[PDB]
Design a protein around this ligand. Structure first.
Ligand SMILES: Nc1nc2c(ncn2[C@@H]2O[C@H](COP(=O)(O)OP(=O)(O)O)[C@@H](O)[C@H]2O)c(=O)[nH]1
Length: 472
């Protein structure tokens, strides 16, 4: 009885397939279906973003993952990101073409498009299965439900019924847990993550009250003193003082491990702490991604092997940061900046995150990291940010844009970058800046000004302008 997570591109059929499967044989976070070949359960929330977030806390609540693609407009970049996320942990991947109920959409380019992703099918090399399904039409459910269990061909031992409570939390709305090992008879003391309580309500997916929990079945518990996190682990204790002592020891241990990760996980400590140095790469364009991947694929043979575990085009989404945290890798943003959630995750944990705007710099830094004598605190710094709120261009010289300066100081003697959607578009120099039509040469923090950049008039609303100095 494995655990299934649905993964795929947006608007491809993940929710539709999950709903059809549930209806064939009240949203809490998980559900289960009984089949003659064997019971199989699914998690309500699909997508790799939620899958890796709980992965990052060592939960490992996945057994088999299924990709859903479409015969039309198939294998989009998010599908590649999802398969990367599934392979980083390491699980068998079962793929399924969903929209095979379209006006002659051929499920043939999908196979040889996904083949060049280490998802080689059976008829090609014999590595992964391919199934035609259709949530709308209904043809293909039986094949998928047989293949999900057929490809689950590991020992699958343990999960002993008579065992102490051991499960993982899913959704802390009252909460829900999908227990891995043991039984969850109500009334006994329970330690759910950093939390203590007693089992008073033990509702099921359909709301029918029960008292016993299956080996790999979900259950919604209610009665705890509050709300734990979404990736913690739950067990059974006996003494409330024991639970409190365990909670305080967990505070101490987490506070120690955060500093240990922020220390050893930096790029500067690669040689000291093989080890198969992992990196997570983000680039502004596909060419600068492929070139960097080809350069970083081979670097050092006898000592340390560098393998890229990510690779995407756009800003540093919090899913990318969660993947890097789970894989304990090093961020690498080439001409791309992080978002708010990525900034939050990087601030919380260690997450060595360094930016670059030159291809050679990344190879140089990685070579020194493998060598072990790299220099620290180099390659410029950020000294000011402004947000563009209005762009006006008179028909005599149109380059001025109104900007609100946020958390920094913008000046005239330093080069600038202009970026949209956390992606840079131009890196030149500052031509003019003025307040109240007065040509001031220094704008403080929190102020408002009018900025015009030389030899570039394309600024729009909601941009960002960063000012930096090459300091060595
Ligand atoms: N023709 C056809 N349309 C489908 C099929 N499956 C899903 N759809 C449509 O595609 C959309 C899928 O959206 P959905 O998967 O729920 O969004 P997501 O959860 O963000 O991926 C739905 O609005 C359906 O109407 C199918 O097998 N055939």
């Amino acid at each position: 009885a494995p655990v299934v997570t649905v993964m795929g591109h947006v608007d491809h059929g993940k929710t539709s397939l999950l709903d059809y499967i549930r209806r064939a044989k009240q949203h809490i976070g998980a559900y289960h279906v009984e089949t003659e070949r064997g019971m199989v359960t699914f998690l309500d929330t699909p997508g790799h973003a939620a899958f890796t977030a709980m992965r990052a806390r060592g939960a490992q609540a996945t057994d088999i993952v299924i990709l859903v693609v479409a015969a039309d407009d198939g294998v989009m970049p998010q599908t590649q990101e999802a398969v990367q996320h599934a392979k980083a942990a390491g699980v068998p991947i079962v793929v399924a073409v969903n929209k095979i109920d379209k006006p002659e959409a051929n499920p043939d380019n999908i196979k040889n498009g996904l083949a060049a992703l280490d998802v080689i099918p059976e008829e090609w090399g014999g590595d992964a299965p391919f199934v035609p399904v259709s949530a709308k039409l209904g043809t293909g459910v039986d094949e998928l439900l047989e293949a999900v269990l057929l490809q689950a061909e590991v020992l699958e031992l343990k999960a002993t019924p008579s065992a102490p409570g051991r499960g993982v939390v899913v959704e802390s709305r009252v909460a829900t847990v999908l227990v891995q090992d043991g039984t969850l008879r109500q009334g006994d003391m329970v330690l759910v993550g950093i939390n203590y309580g007693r089992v008073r309500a033990m509702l099921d997916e359909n709301g029918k009250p029960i008292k016993e929990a299956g080996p790999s079945i979900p259950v919604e518990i209610l009665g705890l003193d509050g709300t734990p996190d979404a990736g913690d682990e739950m067990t059974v204790v006996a003494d409330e003082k024991k639970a409190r002592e365990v909670a305080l020891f967990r505070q101490g241990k987490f506070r120690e491990v955060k500093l240990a990760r922020a220390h050893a996980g930096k790029l500067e400590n690669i040689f000291e702490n093989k080890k198969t140095l992992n990196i997570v790469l983000k680039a502004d364009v596909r060419g600068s991604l492929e070139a960097l991947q080809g350069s970083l694929s081979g670097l050092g043979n006898d000592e340390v092997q560098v393998r890229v575990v990510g690779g995407g085009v756009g800003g540093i989404t919090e899913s990318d940061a969660n993947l890097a945290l789970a894989s304990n890798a090093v961020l690498f943003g080439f001409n791309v900046r992080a978002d708010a959630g990525a900034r939050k995750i990087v601030e919380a944990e260690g997450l060595d995150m360094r930016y670059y705007n030159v291809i050679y710099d990344i190879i140089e830094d990685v070579k020194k990291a493998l060598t072990g004598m790299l220099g620290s605190d180099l390659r410029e710094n950020i000294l000011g940010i402004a947000e563009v709120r209005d762009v006006f261009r008179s028909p005599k010289f149109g380059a001025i844009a109104g900007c609100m300066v946020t958390e920094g100081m913008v000046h005239r003697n330093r080069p600038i970058r202009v970026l949209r959607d956390d992606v840079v578009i131009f890196e030149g120099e500052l031509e003019s800046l003025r307040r109240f039509k007065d040509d001031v040469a220094e704008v403080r923090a929190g102020m408002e000004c009018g900025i015009g950049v030389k030899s570039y008039n394309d600024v729009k609303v909601g941009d960002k302008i960063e000012v930096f100095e090459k300091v060595e």
